[PDB]
Enzyme design. Sequence first.
Site, PDB file in Angstrom:
ATOM      1  N   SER A  72      40.178  19.055  37.210  1.00  0.00           N
ATOM      2  CA  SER A  72      41.366  18.935  38.035  1.00  0.00           C
ATOM      3  C   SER A  72      42.569  18.791  37.088  1.00  0.00           C
ATOM      4  O   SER A  72      42.403  18.695  35.862  1.00  0.00           O
ATOM      5  CB  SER A  72      41.242  17.730  38.964  1.00  0.00           C
ATOM      6  OG  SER A  72      41.266  16.521  38.224  1.00  0.00           O
ATOM      7  N   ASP A 127      46.737  17.002  36.811  1.00  0.00           N
ATOM      8  CA  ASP A 127      47.755  16.121  37.379  1.00  0.00           C
ATOM      9  C   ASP A 127      49.115  16.818  37.254  1.00  0.00           C
ATOM     10  O   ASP A 127      49.451  17.378  36.198  1.00  0.00           O
ATOM     11  CB  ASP A 127      47.799  14.794  36.634  1.00  0.00           C
ATOM     12  CG  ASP A 127      46.458  14.105  36.591  1.00  0.00           C
ATOM     13  OD1 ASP A 127      45.707  14.142  37.572  1.00  0.00           O
ATOM     14  OD2 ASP A 127      46.142  13.512  35.553  1.00  0.00           O
ATOM     15  N   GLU A 132      53.751   7.781  33.460  1.00  0.00           N
ATOM     16  CA  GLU A 132      52.938   8.903  33.903  1.00  0.00           C
ATOM     17  C   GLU A 132      53.455  10.227  33.352  1.00  0.00           C
ATOM     18  O   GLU A 132      52.675  11.050  32.858  1.00  0.00           O
ATOM     19  CB  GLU A 132      52.902   8.999  35.434  1.00  0.00           C
ATOM     20  CG  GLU A 132      52.017   7.970  36.117  1.00  0.00           C
ATOM     21  CD  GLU A 132      50.521   8.148  35.843  1.00  0.00           C
ATOM     22  OE1 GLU A 132      50.112   9.166  35.249  1.00  0.00           O
ATOM     23  OE2 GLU A 132      49.738   7.247  36.216  1.00  0.00           O
ATOM     24  N   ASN A 178      47.127  14.232  41.344  1.00  0.00           N
ATOM     25  CA  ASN A 178      45.889  14.966  41.083  1.00  0.00           C
ATOM     26  C   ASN A 178      45.527  16.101  42.039  1.00  0.00           C
ATOM     27  O   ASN A 178      45.589  15.944  43.254  1.00  0.00           O
ATOM     28  CB  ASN A 178      44.719  13.984  40.987  1.00  0.00           C
ATOM     29  CG  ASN A 178      43.453  14.640  40.472  1.00  0.00           C
ATOM     30  OD1 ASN A 178      42.591  15.045  41.250  1.00  0.00           O
ATOM     31  ND2 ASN A 178      43.329  14.741  39.164  1.00  0.00           N
ATOM     32  N   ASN A 192      42.300  17.321  33.394  1.00  0.00           N
ATOM     33  CA  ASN A 192      41.318  16.262  33.234  1.00  0.00           C
ATOM     34  C   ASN A 192      39.955  16.855  32.940  1.00  0.00           C
ATOM     35  O   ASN A 192      39.727  18.032  33.179  1.00  0.00           O
ATOM     36  CB  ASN A 192      41.272  15.437  34.523  1.00  0.00           C
ATOM     37  CG  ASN A 192      42.620  14.798  34.850  1.00  0.00           C
ATOM     38  OD1 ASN A 192      43.234  14.166  33.996  1.00  0.00           O
ATOM     39  ND2 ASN A 192      43.082  14.960  36.076  1.00  0.00           N
ATOM     40  N   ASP A 224      37.198  16.551  34.536  1.00  0.00           N
ATOM     41  CA  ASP A 224      36.557  17.086  35.726  1.00  0.00           C
ATOM     42  C   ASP A 224      37.125  18.437  36.172  1.00  0.00           C
ATOM     43  O   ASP A 224      36.705  18.971  37.193  1.00  0.00           O
ATOM     44  CB  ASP A 224      36.532  16.069  36.886  1.00  0.00           C
ATOM     45  CG  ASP A 224      37.909  15.770  37.480  1.00  0.00           C
ATOM     46  OD1 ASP A 224      38.929  16.337  37.056  1.00  0.00           O
ATOM     47  OD2 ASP A 224      37.962  14.942  38.407  1.00  0.00           O
TER      48      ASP A 224
END
Length: 129
Positions: A50, A52, A35, A59, A46, A48
């Site tokens: 958002s 991370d 990750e 998120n 991302n 959308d």
Amino acid sequence: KVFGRCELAAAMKRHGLDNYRGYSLGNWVCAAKFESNFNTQATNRNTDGSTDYGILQINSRWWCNDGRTPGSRNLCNMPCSALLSSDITASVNCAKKIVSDGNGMNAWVAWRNRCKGTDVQAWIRGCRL
């Protein structure tokens, strides 16, 4: 802070992640590896809108507030910047809530795609735990 494999394992263990909700420590170290590559300061946006955050790439749409994700739920009640600390306490506390959410570790796409079903034990091999 970029953690070493065994260093991270020991801090996660100390924080109660070994076998939390049935997931052995190797799973958590493997997830952090893919990750974030063991980097607490890792961020990735991302499509959308958002983003991370941190060692476990938590998120912003659901778990933390970064003040720029319309409709964020902030389920972990904390600003996303908190997850970038060298002290992984916040990240671990939030991950505990995420892993208990019903879908387990499948919540982490890198875990599902690169750790799930593999010999995760290799990740803690050689560490003094």
